[PDB]
Structures are given as structure tokens and as C-alpha cells.
């Protein structure tokens, strides 16, 4: 057991060096922000399809990460994610956590409201709660799940381990940018092998995501 704490938060993690650094590059550079922001818990049901969150819009409302800097809005930041699934030893399943850079969701949803009186627009900033996927096999774009493992990824197999951390550096054509318009990457969590449990046990297994920025500059 290890109580990793940096700043204000305190979390418990295993003593495993199963970290994966995206593209082999640590986030290098050139006070009240380096803390573990833990998101809402998503419940994995028996027939769920998958969830996705986009970055760095996930820490815009909660937190002050995208607080307007009244000087100028040039920012540059990396991240450190943590996905963990607290299940018992009688459940079974497998997850696939992967960050794919520059995701574009072609699929459209109706959104909250229209009366066929404007074309229904689409939402691409799920934000805090994330959003469910529609057709997993294609990942709401044409990409096949099969080949998702070409990006940085980690398997969460409920038989062996319940932790998966990915260190992701900054990746963009320009060194700084206006935050609200852009979205750098997307984390996806897809149940490739479905959940199963014999009747009587708990029906929904929880999933917890924890984010920690790595020196977001403003200079």
C-alpha cells in the first residue's frame, strides 16, 4: 500500500511499476494546481458499452485549470491519469483503457432540444460526467477497436490487476493555444470482454478516474 499525496489530496495506490509513458517522452517544461482531481464514479453494468471523456475540458468547470489568466491565455500541460476498478474475486471481465490523440466523433446525437426548427447540433464536450458510446465496434468514428492498441494503452483484467496509469505529454503543432476551442486528446474505456457474475452478488462494478496535471505553464 502507498499513500501518494501531493499538495492537498491523498490517494492510495499499489506498489506496481506498471506505468506506461505515452511515446516515451516525459512531460518536460520549457502551486495550488498539482493535486489529484478525482472524477465521478461510473457504474459498469452488465450491458454497458463504454465511456469517453475529452481533455482538457474535463477540468474546465470543476477546478480552476482553465481559469482565464487575465494576462494572456497561453497554456501548455501534460497529465497523469489513473483508472481503477474495485471488483471482488467472483466477478470477471476486461477493460481497455487507451488515449487516442485528436479524436473526432462523427456520430451525432440529437442533443437536448429542437423542434426540427434548426438542424439538431451536436455536443463534443462531455465535460465532467462523460458520455456513453453508441456503436462500440467502430468507436463513433470508423476506427476499428481491434486496432486501438496502436495508441498508448493498458489492459484492466479483473482477474489480476485493478490499476492502469498513463503519463501523456503535450502534443500539438503550436507550443501554446487558446484552450476553450481546442481539445487535445480523448481517454476511452471500452468493455471488450463483458461483465458476468452469478446471480445474487453486486450488479454494478464501479470505475474511478483520477487526473493530475503536470506543470501547466502560463508564461
Amino acid at each position, epitope marked *: 500500500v502507498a499513500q501518494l499525496t501531493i499538495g492537498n489530496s491523498t490517494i492510495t495506490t499499489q506498489e506496481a511499476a506498471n506505468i506506461v509513458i505515452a511515446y516515451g517522452e516525459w512531460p518536460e517544461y520549457c502551486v495550488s494546481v498539482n493535486r489529484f482531481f478525482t472524477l465521478d464514479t461510473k457504474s459498469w453494468a452488465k450491458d454497458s458499452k463504454g465511456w469517453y471523456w475529452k481533455f482538457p475540458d474535463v477540468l474546465t468547470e470543476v477546478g480552476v485549470f482553465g481559469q482565464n489568466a487575465q494576462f494572456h491565455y497561453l497554456y501548455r500541460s501534460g497529465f497523469c491519469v489513473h483508472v481503477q476498478c474495485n471488483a471482488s474475486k467472483f466477478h470477471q471481465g476486461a477493460l481497455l483503457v487507451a488515449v487516442l490523440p485528436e479524436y473526432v466523433l462523427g456520430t451525432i446525437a440529437g*442533443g*437536448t*432540444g*429542437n*423542434e426540427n*426548427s*434548426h438542424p439538431p447540433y451536436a*455536443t463534443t*464536450q462531455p*465535460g465532467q460526467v462523460g458520455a456513453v458510446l453508441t456503436h462500440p465496434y467502430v468507436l463513433d468514428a470508423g476506427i476499428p477497436l481491434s486496432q486501438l492498441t496502436v495508441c498508448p494503452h493498458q489492459w484492466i483484467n479483473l482477474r489480476t490487476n485493478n490499476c492502469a496509469t498513463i503519463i501523456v505529454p503535450y502534443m500539438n503543432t503550436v507550443p501554446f493555444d487558446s484552450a476553450l476551442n481546442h481539445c487535445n486528446f480523448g481517454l476511452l474505456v471500452i468493455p471488450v470482454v463483458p461483465l458476468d457474475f452469478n446471480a445474487g452478488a453486486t450488479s454494478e462494478i464501479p470505475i474511478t478516474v483520477t487526473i493530475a496535471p503536470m506543470c501547466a505553464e502560463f508564461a
Partner: nanobody
Amino acid sequence: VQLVQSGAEVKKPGASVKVSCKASGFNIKDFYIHWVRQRPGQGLEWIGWIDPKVGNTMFDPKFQGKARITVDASISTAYLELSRLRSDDTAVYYCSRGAAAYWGQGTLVTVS
């Protein structure tokens, strides 16, 4: 289901007003709430709608700076805050969910 609104106002140039739009029966977080205008003796105009779920608000190019739409979920309102009024901004204002279902009564504003 009807959208009732505030009363008329008489103001001076350079001021800032805000009209109100009451919801009734239907939930406020579901439909878009558009806002339209009618200068006296002129055809209907359009300002902008609001997405009440997350807060997407977008306006016609003309009033890009001037206008500001906000929504409140508790008391179920929809405010349109004008600012920097000129002699051209005398008109009746209406709030309507989508286009068809209902609209509200006209709220005339006076800047003279």
C-alpha cells in the same frame, strides 16, 4: 403551458435592461429558448438561442457584443440582458421554446 414575461420599461440611452421569461409546466433544461425582436414597422428579427444543459449561447453577428442570455434552473427563468442601448433599440421582445409550441407576449422597451 405558457411563457409569461415582465412589463414594459422606459429607459435612457447607454443603459442596460434585462427582460425575463417564465417557464410553466415544462422543464426548463430540455428545450432551446430562442429570442426574437420586432422593431416597430419592421419585420421580425432574431438575436440568439441558448442551450440550457451546458450553456452554449450564440448570437446573430449584429448583436454579438450587446446581448447576453442566461438561464436559471431553480426559478426557471430565461433572461436577455441588453447593454449600450441606442435610439434604434425600441421594440417588442418575445421568448419562445423552439418555434412552435408557445411564445410569450410582447415586451416593449423605450430608450427615448
